[PDB]
């Protein structure tokens, strides 16, 4: 679990969005596993606007942060799950690191701010949904 709170927006994994997220929907994209909902309170986070390929993510299944080198946002095949059919997930960045399904929502940050959230994984792999291209989050 986990979310980004920026301005009057809440960014979550689309497959973990609540009834309240859907009732206050701003934007969602199944191909990215993202959903953004509106909030009444002002957020605590800021978004990176950069091309960093290194950063640190929070791994809830280890209660620890880990440093990672990750690929640029790309279209990557993701196997079927209870949440989605087998498809290409877009704007996804992969890295070597530990992850389990419940780790989705953990934030990846670089020196500039929030880069994205955990969305996929594998055997010693962790994949992050990028949010740096969503310029409207800042206004
Ligand atoms: C951190 S998730 C994870 C971690 C390790 C392993 Br093995 C396997 C996973 C599962 C995984 O990749 N997905 C991706 C899915 C999606 N984004 O299409 C939504 C959550 C889940 C079902
Ligand atoms: Zn950066």
How many other β-carbons are positioned within 10 Å of the β-carbon of residue 31?
15
Q: Is the CB of 27 under 6 A from ligand 1?
A: no
Q: Which residues surround ligand 2, an ion (CB under 5 A)?
A: 48, 50, 52, 110, 112
Which technique? X-ray
Resolution (A): 1.3
Nearest 5°: CA angle at 100, between 97 and 104?
A: 95
Q: Is the CB of 118 under 6 A from ligand 1?
A: yes
* CA–CA dist 62, 58 (Å, integer): 9
> C-alpha distances in angstroms, 103 versus 18, 39, 93, 127?
17, 23, 15, 11
Residue 108 contacts residue 56 (beta carbons within 8 Å): yes
* CA–CA dist 112, 55 (Å, integer): 10
């Amino acid at each position: 679990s986990g979310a980004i709170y920026v301005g009057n927006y809440r960014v979550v994994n689309r497959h973990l969005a609540t009834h309240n997220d859907w009732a206050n929907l701003v934007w969602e994209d199944s191909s990215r596993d993202l959903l953004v909902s509106s909030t009444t309170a002002q957020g605590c986070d800021t978004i990176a606007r950069c091309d960093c390929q290194t950063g640190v993510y929070y791994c809830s299944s280890r209660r620890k942060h880990y440093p990672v080198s990750f690929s640029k946002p790309s279209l990557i095949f993701v196997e079927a799950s209870e949440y989605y059919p087998a498809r290409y997930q877009s704007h996804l960045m992969l890295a070597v690191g530990h992850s389990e399904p419940g780790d989705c929502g953990g934030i990846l940050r670089c020196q500039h701010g929030v880069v994205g959230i955990v969305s996929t994984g594998g055997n010693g792999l962790v994949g992050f949904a990028d949010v740096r291209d969503l310029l409207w989050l800042d206004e």
